UniProtKB/TrEMBL annotation, chains A, B, C:
This is Hemagglutinin. The chain holds residues 16 to 357 of 582 of the full protein. The keyword tRNA processing does not apply. The lineage of its organism: Viruses, Riboviria, Orthornavirae, Negarnaviricota, Polyploviricotina. GO terms for cellular component: host cell plasma membrane; membrane; viral envelope; virion membrane. Belongs to the influenza viruses hemagglutinin family. Palmitoylated. In natural infection, inactive HA is matured into HA1 and HA2 outside the cell by one or more trypsin-like, arginine-specific endoprotease secreted by the bronchial epithelial cells. One identified protease that may be involved in this process is secreted in lungs by club cells.
Amino acid sequence: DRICTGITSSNSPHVVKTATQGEVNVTGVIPLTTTPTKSHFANLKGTQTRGKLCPNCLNCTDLDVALGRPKCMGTIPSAKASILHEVKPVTSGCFPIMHDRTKIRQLPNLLRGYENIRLSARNVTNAETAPGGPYIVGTSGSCPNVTNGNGFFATMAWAVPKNKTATNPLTVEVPYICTKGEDQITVWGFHSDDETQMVKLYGDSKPQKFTSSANGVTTHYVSQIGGFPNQAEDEGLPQSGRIVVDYMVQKPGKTGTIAYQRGVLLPQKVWCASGRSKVIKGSLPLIGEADCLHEKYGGLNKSKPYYTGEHAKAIGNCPIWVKTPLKLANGTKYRPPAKLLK
Amino acid sequence: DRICTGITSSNSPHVVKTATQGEVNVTGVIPLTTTPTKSHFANLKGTQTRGKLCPNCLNCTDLDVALGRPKCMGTIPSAKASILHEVKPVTSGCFPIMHDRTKIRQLPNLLRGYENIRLSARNVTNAETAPGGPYIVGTSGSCPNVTNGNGFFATMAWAVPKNKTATNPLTVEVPYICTKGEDQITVWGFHSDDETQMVKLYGDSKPQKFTSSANGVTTHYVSQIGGFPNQAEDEGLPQSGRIVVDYMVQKPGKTGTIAYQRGVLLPQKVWCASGRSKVIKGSLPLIGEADCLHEKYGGLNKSKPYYTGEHAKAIGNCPIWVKTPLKLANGTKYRPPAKLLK
Amino acid sequence: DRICTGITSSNSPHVVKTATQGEVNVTGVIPLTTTPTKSHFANLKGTQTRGKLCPNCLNCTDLDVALGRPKCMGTIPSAKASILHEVKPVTSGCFPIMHDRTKIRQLPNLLRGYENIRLSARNVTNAETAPGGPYIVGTSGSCPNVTNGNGFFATMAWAVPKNKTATNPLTVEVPYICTKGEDQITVWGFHSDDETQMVKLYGDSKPQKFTSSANGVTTHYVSQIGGFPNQAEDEGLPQSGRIVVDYMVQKPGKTGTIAYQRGVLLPQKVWCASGRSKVIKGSLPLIGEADCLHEKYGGLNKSKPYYTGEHAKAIGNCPIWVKTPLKLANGTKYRPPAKLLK
Amino acid sequence: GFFGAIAGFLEGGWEGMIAGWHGYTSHGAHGVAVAADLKSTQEAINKITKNLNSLSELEVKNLQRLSGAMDELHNEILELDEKVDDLRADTISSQIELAVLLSNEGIINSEDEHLLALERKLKKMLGPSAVDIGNGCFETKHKCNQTCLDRIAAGTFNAGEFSLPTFDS
Amino acid sequence: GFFGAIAGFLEGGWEGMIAGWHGYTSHGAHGVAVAADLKSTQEAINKITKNLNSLSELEVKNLQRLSGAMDELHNEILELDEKVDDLRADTISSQIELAVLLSNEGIINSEDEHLLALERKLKKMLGPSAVDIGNGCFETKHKCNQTCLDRIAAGTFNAGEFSLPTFDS
Amino acid sequence: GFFGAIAGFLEGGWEGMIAGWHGYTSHGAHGVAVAADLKSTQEAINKITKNLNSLSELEVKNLQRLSGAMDELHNEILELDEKVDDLRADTISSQIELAVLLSNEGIINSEDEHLLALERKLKKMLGPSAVDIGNGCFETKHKCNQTCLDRIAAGTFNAGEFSLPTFDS
Ligand SMILES: *[C@@H]1O[C@H](CO)[C@@H](O[C@@H]2O[C@H](CO)[C@@H](O)[C@H](O)[C@H]2NC(C)=O)[C@H](O)[C@H]1NC(C)=O
Ligand SMILES: *[C@@H]1O[C@H](CO)[C@@H](O[C@@H]2O[C@H](CO)[C@@H](O)[C@H](O)[C@H]2NC(C)=O)[C@H](O)[C@H]1NC(C)=O
Ligand SMILES: *[C@@H]1O[C@H](CO)[C@@H](O[C@@H]2O[C@H](CO)[C@@H](O)[C@H](O)[C@H]2NC(C)=O)[C@H](O)[C@H]1NC(C)=O
Ligand SMILES: *[C@@H]1O[C@H](CO)[C@@H](O[C@@H]2O[C@H](CO)[C@@H](O)[C@H](O)[C@H]2NC(C)=O)[C@H](O)[C@H]1NC(C)=O
Ligand SMILES: *[C@@H]1O[C@H](CO)[C@@H](O[C@@H]2O[C@H](CO)[C@@H](O)[C@H](O)[C@H]2NC(C)=O)[C@H](O)[C@H]1NC(C)=O
Ligand SMILES: *[C@@H]1O[C@H](CO)[C@@H](O[C@@H]2O[C@H](CO)[C@@H](O)[C@H](O)[C@H]2NC(C)=O)[C@H](O)[C@H]1NC(C)=O
Ligand SMILES: *[C@@H]1O[C@H](CO)[C@@H](O[C@H]2O[C@H](CO)[C@@H](O)[C@H](O)[C@H]2NC(C)=O)[C@H](O)[C@H]1NC(C)=O
Ligand SMILES: *[C@@H]1O[C@H](CO)[C@@H](O[C@H]2O[C@H](CO)[C@@H](O)[C@H](O)[C@H]2NC(C)=O)[C@H](O)[C@H]1NC(C)=O
Ligand SMILES: *[C@@H]1O[C@H](CO)[C@@H](O[C@H]2O[C@H](CO)[C@@H](O)[C@H](O)[C@H]2NC(C)=O)[C@H](O)[C@H]1NC(C)=O
Ligand SMILES: *[C@@H]1O[C@H](CO)[C@@H](O[C@H]2O[C@H](CO)[C@@H](O)[C@H](O)[C@H]2NC(C)=O)[C@H](O)[C@H]1NC(C)=O
Ligand SMILES: *[C@@H]1O[C@H](CO)[C@@H](O[C@H]2O[C@H](CO)[C@@H](O)[C@H](O)[C@H]2NC(C)=O)[C@H](O)[C@H]1NC(C)=O
Ligand SMILES: *[C@@H]1O[C@H](CO)[C@@H](O[C@H]2O[C@H](CO)[C@@H](O)[C@H](O)[C@H]2NC(C)=O)[C@H](O)[C@H]1NC(C)=O
Ligand SMILES: *[C@@H]1O[C@H](CO)[C@@H](O)[C@H](O)[C@H]1NC(C)=O
Ligand SMILES: *[C@@H]1O[C@H](CO)[C@@H](O)[C@H](O)[C@H]1NC(C)=O
Ligand SMILES: *[C@@H]1O[C@H](CO)[C@@H](O)[C@H](O)[C@H]1NC(C)=O
Ligand SMILES: *[C@@H]1O[C@H](CO)[C@@H](O)[C@H](O)[C@H]1NC(C)=O
Ligand SMILES: *[C@@H]1O[C@H](CO)[C@@H](O)[C@H](O)[C@H]1NC(C)=O
Ligand SMILES: *[C@@H]1O[C@H](CO)[C@@H](O)[C@H](O)[C@H]1NC(C)=O
Ligand SMILES: *[C@H]1O[C@H](CO)[C@@H](O)[C@H](O)[C@H]1NC(C)=O
Ligand SMILES: *[C@H]1O[C@H](CO)[C@@H](O)[C@H](O)[C@H]1NC(C)=O
Ligand SMILES: *[C@H]1O[C@H](CO)[C@@H](O)[C@H](O)[C@H]1NC(C)=O
């Protein structure tokens, strides 16, 4: 009698990658792969997830909020994980801005970058005492104050001069003004209007030159007088003029320089920000809680160590992307059944 | 009698790297390495390879072509693999440009970036109807139209005013104008000339200010009046003046802003582009077909899995660069011949 | 009698990571890890290490030196390894500069980037022959020449005009001027002063416009007339005015363009630089020699193959950073002592 | 595998072997007997389990958007950022691909070392009267049908049940 | 290797072994006989072949110029791009370096497992009258010259050609 | 390990084994004898040594500041540069983590192959009168106390010191 060692033969439809034996069929396998499927986003587990930059600051754009629109002046919750729903964020009211002429639209998302952002304890520069003639803090219809009347972005002052006379460029110095080693985000721009209204609001009807410097970054603009594009992302018909608005970014202890003439929107309430919230691109009516947020697959929770599919930015507790569906052998190599004996 | 197992002893000049036994001598090896050798470039196998941005658009620079030089107005083939032969591309005729004053030279290579590029179905802005006085579409000798006479870059209009009077900066609005979600490349600049000719072509003899905005990117120029550098990369002697030319890049649905005075070269025929051709730096009189294109070794086809030598950008079906010549053991460890027996 | 093979049991407090058996206790281990400890920096072994950009050019800032301050005009040693001690380098004397209005402060560190840097064989542009009226090379108190009197940064010329009259923007052409394929760093700026002194030094009392172009990079400034910030990083009381200064970077064979009015500090002695010294951020009173320089741990020499702790830029012969303390088994798996026999 | 082909083992499956991966076959007048070993199949499943836990531990930094990028201003920087993400992903993927494959090679090959052990366990219990062929088989002085073999598989076998010499641990 | 030194094998080359890598030596009144085994040498060459095919499969994204870089405007971005290329290359190179070395360690070591198998193939065919030394050698009750050994190498050997007991598969 | 559990070896430490990692135990009327082998413990220490030298060789590009970055102007580029450094580090760290772990798995497992060899060295010197159990043990026709076993550990053992047959190399 002969007693021998043997191995099994059985259903071996699963194939595996080996170095020495090429690719082989195997009894069974533990898969390490999944393809996730597109779904709605969710609040990231061990954190808090940014929505409209300001919840509780209802019915407003992040851009609106950013710009310090009258009503939209609510308070910002800190988070360590932010989502970007607007690649091109919009304004939903207030004074007509010619958005597409400045990096401005991105301001909400720049802010989103940070863990902590705040409106401002104080305003940077004294609106009236500013270089140039004494200014009436221009107040504008079509930007309803809460009561009403003339509400103008806390962000900046509508610098209208008594003693209406043309100006040779002036320089305001926007200092640091932020607690801690916070990032300061300054904001500003210029109003310009039609021939007649120009002369009326400021004694001049001439294109106006504006130049800002901040940390070696310099920008120069020239105002427009007549024939402005249709107003959009606003309210109703002070079609008279438009605002060109920009942001300036100030690192801890750095100063800024705005040269200006007439139409100047001097900075006022100015963002202080600090810390780094992790940002991702997500289409967002946030629903529930997931382990992990995938730019594409969206809300997703961790089943297997890897996933296959479209690679993308993903934050949290995420499975690792992998080229191709991987499998771990949990069985033995296929062996054809034996009568190969005597 | 004793029968035993043994292994071979033989010529073992090849050495191999192991973890446990240090470095050991071996019977034979399969090498996985090659050093390639410098050679001419070639059309990349499973694709099509860009040459002068426009073949069939003969005897012209890519810059020429880019700028829309009269003759050089041929049609661009799409490709998915492009080569860069000019780090500093040249102009070979037409109107004297002071190249080194703008990012302009790179335009050909920006375009090369794309899978699809096209001259333009239409021109962006109505040359005569443009803000400022009615303009004669300036036509210039030394840029031979096909017949001849006055051919001026399809790219932009030589904006000469009837009613010759000095101007306070004006703003043209260059809209999107591109099919699909294509990239729009706008183009423009300004002419300026000597004291007398200035006053003659435009009622003024004053440095002229130009500012463009596009997607938060702002540029500001100041024209020159007398004493221009020798003309080069042109034809012959309207030495009177020179052109400073620039490009503007417009993402899908974005608008542009050019403020200008006199000398304005308003944009006309404007590039639409889309898709992403893979670009490499290659010196190019293209010859034949290779598996793979190496910035240095050039035309190269795949022999072994890795290569040793100079690392560089390489596209296609390329061997992987490797620190040092690698070898796979195809034999046994060296064993000194035996009489070590009794 | 039975003779058997066995393995040891002994003190096995060290634990190790395995694929097949999970984590196991082991006789002994060779550690591959260390946490280094913060210490002073040192001259990097197989190289030379930059200090104040100019040793032997004593008691001066790198910025001072960079700017070509009268005394601080010593000669620069080449090195292949540089250290950055000043994130915001300072000026320690000479004429009041409004630093925070230009990328200027970084100039020392830009220079530090290179293997070879030099002051200048010659000066770029003829100070007096420059476009505009003939200029007296302005010489300034409060920047003591070696003897004394009026020493002004070799970098640039204080362009004061005889025939004091307002100017329409002029264009100087700063050519290449550097040996080899060196990088040229041009330097320049503008002086501006109070209402009265302006009119006195130049027949005008008007904000002055300045624009430079270099390799498609454009910058535009507007001078200030009254109310300058307190002077700091200087000497004593020509509080009359201030200098706004900038740098321009010229790649091999490229030209530059400065448009200017009055106050112009035309470039003079101009940096040529070449080669690439490896740069790191290090707080530096350099002491001794180390194997390797760690942005944090500082001076450090190679004990074990890896280190654990804070990751950072490190140059030289450095241990590789590692997630967690790693250990190599130098013993056998723990085996509980045996009486498990019969 | 390479060991099994050379030292003339049998590349034979025994589709009879239901309850386990490796065990013993038994040959004679009874025909062929087959039995799984419920420790070799268990010990193999262990390694694999602990190997999974091994592959799972790996952590790789999140990989996310750039804090100060800005989606219309900084496209060229933003583009290099994608390159970075792509390369990172493609790199760490090839690494994992390696880790697993190595892991599989391990498991697949180790199978022969099970067989080899299982043989030595057998040699003990068959006593000194058996004859080690080298085949991975033993010529035994007694008959072994299904029942006998099942004791062999369980470790409750005793030679001398057919009065033959016995090693006693 | 470590196994061969400990269990007193022989770190001896047999430069006689032309047609193969591993096989048998044969000792006695005839002197020394040597023969390659043309399956152990073949089975070793296989692994290696399939190991090459293994190393070859690896794919790594192309690594090329930046689509919107621009060679005089964006140098700092363009510079970081080189860093990226360099690091990527240096990273993926060290990984491959590892893959191969591991691969070599595998092949080099596996050699001893050939020998070990080749022994067991031998044990079968020499019958139950041979004596397993542990040396990797067998004391045999009959003489074995070159011819006999060549049958041993081919698997066409039969004990009892010298009338001795035989295992029959 | 998996081999030791299956082929009923002994998961037993012999805390007697001071001078070495692996060696022999000896059983009988004398009680239990224990002796280290000073070549198996040495040959194991070798591998490890050469494995360290192996892990040490790895070189990875320095990773430093950007030559033309500029610390207030180019922050966004400078930021991506950190990303790059972080990823690189996190990548190359996971790779090393793998290299070592693999390395450990190697060393840890190889231990059983020492034992296995050490057995075969023993089988030789005990002569043809011993009986290979498969246990990793041998039933011997003579007594072996501490002294005898120490000769076994040293390779200066000779059967027939108790007049029994001997293999002579
Ligand atoms: C080994 O695995 C492969 C699949 O993993 C089996 O062959 C496959 O048969 C199915 C039948 O539906 C097909 O869908 C697959 O395309 C086939 N594989 C390929 C890619 O050729 C094979 O039968 C398995 N086992 C055996 C006994 O070889
Ligand atoms: C992933 O895991 C989480 C659990 O951590 C799931 O969250 C549940 O979501 C449902 C509806 O969205 C809620 O009612 C539960 O409160 C959540 N947790 C549980 C199970 O109590 C999440 O849905 C999972 N899957 C997906 C697709 O994200
Ligand atoms: C093992 O390999 C090395 C080379 O791979 C052999 O020694 C070399 O001898 C040649 C003779 O021309 C020299 O060019 C090499 O420089 C030597 N190697 C080094 C780096 O020392 C050696 O002879 C080979 N085989 C043996 C038997 O050791
Ligand atoms: C690499 O491979 C290709 C084949 O795919 C070679 O291309 C041949 O090139 C010659 C001359 O350049 C032509 O006559 C043939 O038509 C091409 N293919 C063949 C062989 O028919 C290429 O030359 C190879 N080597 C190099 C150096 O690139
Ligand atoms: C195996 O290793 C661990 C530590 O590496 C030992 O258990 C530890 O006991 C010490 C006593 O001071 C504690 O500090 C550790 O926290 C314990 N380890 C953990 C994390 O649980 C263990 O005793 C070692 N050997 C044995 C015999 O198991
Ligand atoms: C690292 O290694 C170097 C040796 O290469 C040590 O340098 C010594 O430093 C001391 C004082 O700093 C000097 O007196 C010696 O001249 C140096 N070399 C020797 C030993 O002769 C260095 O100190 C070591 N450790 C550290 C903390 O950097
Ligand atoms: C909203 O706007 C009005 C101005 O349009 C602000 O104050 C105005 O109304 C007050 C009535 O309580 C008057 O006392 C003020 O004189 C008047 N301002 C002017 C035009 O001089 C008012 O502060 C705003 N709402 C809030 C936040 O209270
Ligand atoms: C690996 O394979 C085995 C079968 O080959 C799996 O199943 C085993 O474990 C089960 C626990 O769910 C037990 O119920 C079974 O007794 C046992 N075998 C079977 C299927 O009868 C094991 O779970 C597989 N996967 C893993 C997690 O390793
Ligand atoms: C080339 O240039 C000329 C202008 O220099 C263009 O048209 C001119 O010649 C025509 C003769 O057929 C005349 O009918 C036009 O009036 C005249 N243009 C002027 C100066 O008014 C001509 O279109 C160009 N060549 C082409 C593409 O046909
Ligand atoms: C690996 O080594 C062997 C020799 O050690 C190579 O050669 C073998 O295969 C050849 C096919 O070209 C046969 O003709 C030979 O019979 C055989 N051995 C020799 C040289 O006589 C094998 O090709 C080597 N390389 C590879 C591809 O693995
Ligand atoms: C330092 O500055 C003075 C100018 O303030 C330079 O030359 C001055 O002094 C000289 C005395 O030797 C006179 O000959 C010069 O005329 C005078 N310059 C003027 C104001 O015209 C002097 O060159 C400088 N020091 C050095 C480097 O020699
Ligand atoms: C690995 O472990 C051994 C002990 O297990 C270390 O010690 C050995 O080598 C020493 C050289 O310093 C000798 O003096 C000892 O004889 C020997 N064993 C002991 C401790 O008695 C060995 O060095 C360890 N580390 C290394 C470098 O591998
Ligand atoms: C405004 O008017 C005042 C008084 O009428 C005049 O003196 C002054 O010049 C004007 N303001 C300025 C600063 O031009
Ligand atoms: C050009 O001339 C016309 C008529 O002679 C004149 O009315 C006009 O002011 C001038 N153009 C402009 C817009 O200045
Ligand atoms: C300076 O004065 C001269 C002579 O008094 C005069 O002719 C000239 O116009 C002035 N300079 C310039 C270029 O304006
Ligand atoms: C094996 O043989 C014995 C005879 O002694 C018998 O008792 C037993 O039932 C047999 N097993 C089977 C089921 O074949
Ligand atoms: C081996 O021995 C036999 C004697 O029986 C003989 O026939 C054969 O030729 C021998 N082989 C050689 C070539 O030594
Ligand atoms: C082993 O046995 C022999 C008896 O022949 C004796 O000489 C020797 O001392 C013994 N060893 C020990 C120390 O037990
Ligand atoms: C800040 O300046 C604004 C003008 O923008 C002024 O109206 C306001 O009173 C100041 N601060 C407060 C208390 O909001
Ligand atoms: C576009 O405008 C140009 C001026 O650049 C004009 O001459 C041309 O007719 C227009 N389009 C065509 C048909 O080329
Ligand atoms: C370079 O020009 C300067 C003015 O900055 C002049 O004083 C000097 O003589 C020139 N070169 C020398 C010799 O320093």
